[PDB]
Design a protein around this ligand. Structure first.
Ligand SMILES: CCCCCCCCCC(=O)O
Ligand SMILES: CCCCCCCCCC(=O)O
Ligand SMILES: CCCCCCCCCC(=O)O
Ligand SMILES: CCCCCCCCCC(=O)O
Ligand SMILES: CCCCCCCCCC(=O)O
Ligand SMILES: CCCCCCCCCC(=O)O
Ligand SMILES: CCCCCCCCCC(=O)O
Ligand SMILES: CCCCCCCCCC(=O)O
Ligand SMILES: CCCCCCCCCC(=O)O
Ligand SMILES: CCCCCCCCCC(=O)O
Length: 582
């Protein structure tokens, strides 16, 4: 066109336009004050309007990149607030922007964001909802500089809706709070999955990512043709590459184009792309990305036919080893939307391995014959894992469930810090409630989805401060094998118990007046230390100590005399127990 600005303005809309302009400036200039950005966004929104009136207007022709970088350098403090960054402003653009991208901090040093009181929020909301929302958007944006802007703007709207529906309720806290807590987990998972994808794309390479994308796309569009899927796995991979790099404009467009393409060729891909394809430009890609699995064709051959019996398996495989393996995935994946992608990748690598051992010997069509027999154990393991954990989560609550995990993982890796153990066992438990809620069909995939980021967080920390060689083995190990590795660790027999400390087992009646949250975290932290001290304790010897401690609290946090019963009856328990546990 002529005016790239006008086009995007007209396209996006004043409302979404200003929101994104802010998020953008916020992600680059993570240090300037809110008041500073609003001024920028306004100066910018005013310009764009100029172009929407007359495209020939000065600069209305300039490239978005050029215009953007021009304003960033309009920041005087730049040199003292950012210093080195102010140096980028001295280059021709290809480099100037490339320069900017570099000085983007992934993990800056800002004060953790504290959640005000429901009523303080609801009032701020009502008084001036624009600057209240804009201000909070600016706070999130600057802390997560690589979060895909449009997706962030999409959470924003989900936030604006919780306050709208809740701030008008009798019990605003019972309404809002459980909503903010959810939005928080989702937003945190989302940012972790993005970061996780770029990490793997660089660590493991284009091949692995393409293999992942194939199995992934085959489950959703089981009707599209492998040629169609390859077309998409190719573009898709190009999209993450650019998005990961950091350029929002490039990333934004790449996503736009691929979304349009998918829509025009709807029929060739899936039947469920109905809604997503009618939605506006800003929601299309996101919608499609979340879309539901199209139904898998009823009449289709068997796999053993084309991949087990066939005496060409080796001829076609050697002709092009990757295109053939991708076919196996495409074929196996669209037949199993109930499998986790990592399970699929686990099979493809098992197939690839035997295919290499058999196409090089006597009579292969007989070497790789008992291959599907090798898949059984691989499949049965995660399945049984889900069954056993969802069946137990049904016997004990989410809390009494998390505790069981606590015991399990502390015995596996006692070395791990206690606050870390709790955080992890906590998260895992939550994964237990959102996934065990689906039928045997959507379980495995649900689990892998959450587990991935959870497990990755565990490694990200451990990375910073290693503590166990065992976690490091599983963590730096195969991404496809991370989970299995951990489920594999056995009770650490090496580990030498920690010296007793009653201070660590000194509870004061304050626990009587603590939110169910702090109450648990309190009892749960003790539980961890308890096992770190006596790791050979049984579930019997432990269910006992836990139950005794159970009634105990009811006896003093409800007695006319409090902190006494907590010091007299307590002295008795730490004693009875100390002995009960050899
Ligand atoms: C833009 C809308 C921002 C919503 C406010 C974030 C609350 C964060 C929290 O404490 O969970
Ligand atoms: C912002 C990255 C923080 C990582 C935390 C991931 C959220 C845990 C997922 C969940 O249990 O709901
Ligand atoms: C294992 C091959 C690496 C491909 C990267 C896939 C990362 C997706 C992580 C997830 O969301 O679960
Ligand atoms: C195994 C490798 C799978 C990658 C398939 C790429 C096809 C284009
Ligand atoms: C700046 C332009 C933002 C355009 C967002 C639409 C792209 C997408 O669907 O992801
Ligand atoms: C999860 C596959 C959905 C395909 C849509 C491609 C655009 C969203 C890219 C992330
Ligand atoms: C508990 C969840 C176990 C399933 C993880 C999915 C997989 O790695 O196959
Ligand atoms: C052939 C299947 C491709 C699997 C990609 C392997 C990289 C994941 C890993 O083992 O860490
Ligand atoms: C230190 C954190 C403990 C790691 C737990 C990893 C989860 C594996 C799932 C399971 O087998 O239950
Ligand atoms: C020291 C012992 C700590 C055990 C904590 C008991 C879990 C509390 C409960 O059962 O609700």
């Amino acid at each position: 066109h002529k005016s790239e600005v006008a086009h995007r303005f007209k396209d996006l809309g004043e409302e979404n336009f200003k929101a994104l302009v802010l998020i953008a400036f916020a992600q680059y200039l993570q240090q300037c004050p809110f008041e500073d950005h609003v001024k920028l966004v306004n100066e910018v929104t005013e310009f764009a309007k100029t172009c929407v009136a007359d495209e020939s207007a000065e600069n209305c022709d300039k490239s978005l990149h050029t215009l953007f970088g021009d304003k960033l350098c309009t920041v005087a403090t730049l040199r003292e607030t950012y210093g080195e960054m102010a140096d980028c402003c001295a280059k021709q653009e290809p480099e100037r922007n490339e320069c900017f991208l570099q000085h983007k901090d992934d993990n800056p040093n800002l004060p953790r964001l504290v959640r005000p009181e429901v009523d303080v929020m609801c009032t701020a909301f009502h008084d001036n909802e624009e600057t209240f929302l804009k201000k909070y958007l600016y706070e999130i944006a600057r802390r997560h500089p690589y979060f895909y802007a449009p997706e962030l703007l999409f959470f924003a709207k989900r936030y604006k809706a919780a306050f709208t529906e809740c701030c008008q309720a009798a019990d605003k806290a019972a309404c809002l709070l459980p909503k903010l807590d959810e939005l928080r987990d989702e937003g945190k998972a989302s940012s972790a999955k993005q970061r996780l994808k770029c990490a793997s794309l660089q660590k493991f390479g284009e091949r692995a990512f393409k293999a992942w994308a194939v199995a992934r796309l085959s489950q959703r569009f089981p009707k599209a043709e492998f040629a169609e899927v390859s077309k998409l796995v190719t573009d898709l991979t190009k999209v993450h590459t650019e998005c990961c790099h950091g350029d929002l404009l490039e990333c934004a467009d790449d996503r736009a184009d691929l979304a349009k393409y998918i829509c025009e060729n709807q029929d060739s891909i899936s039947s469920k792309l109905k809604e997503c394809c009618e939605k506006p430009l800003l929601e299309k890609s996101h919608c499609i990305a979340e879309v539901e699995n199209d139904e898998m064709p009823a009449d289709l051959p068997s796999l053993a036919a084309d991949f087990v019996e066939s005496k060409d398996v080796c001829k076609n495989y050697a002709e092009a080893k990757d295109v053939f393996l991708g076919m196996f995935l495409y074929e196996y994946a669209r037949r199993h939307p109930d499998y986790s992608v990592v399970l699929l990748l686990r099979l493809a690598k098992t197939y690839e391995t035997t295919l290499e051992k058999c196409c090089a010997a006597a009579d292969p069509h007989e070497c790789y014959a008992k291959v599907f027999d090798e898949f059984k154990p691989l499949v049965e393991e995660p399945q049984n894992l889900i069954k056993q954990n969802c069946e137990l989560f049904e016997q004990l609550g989410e809390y009494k469930f998390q505790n069981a995990l606590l015991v399990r993982y502390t015995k596996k890796v006692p070395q791990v810090s206690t606050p870390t153990l709790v955080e992890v066992s906590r998260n895992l438990g939550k994964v237990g409630s959102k996934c065990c809620k689906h039928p045997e069909a959507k379980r495995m995939p649900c689990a892998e989805d959450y587990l991935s980021v959870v497990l990755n967080q565990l490694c990200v920390l451990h990375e910073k401060t290693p503590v166990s060689d065992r976690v490091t083995k599983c963590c730096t190990e195969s991404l496809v094998n991370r989970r299995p590795c951990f489920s594999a660790l056995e009770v650490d027999e090496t580990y030498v118990p920690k010296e007793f400390n009653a201070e660590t087992f000194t509870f004061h009646a304050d626990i009587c007046t603590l939110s169910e949250k702090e109450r648990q975290i309190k009892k749960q932290t003790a539980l961890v230390e308890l096992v770190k001290h006596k790791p050979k304790a049984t579930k019997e010897q432990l269910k006992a100590v836990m139950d005794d401690f159970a009634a105990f609290v009811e006896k003093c946090c409800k007695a006319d005399d409090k902190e006494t019963c907590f010091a007299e009856e307590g002295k008795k328990l730490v004693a009875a127990s100390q002995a009960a546990l050899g």
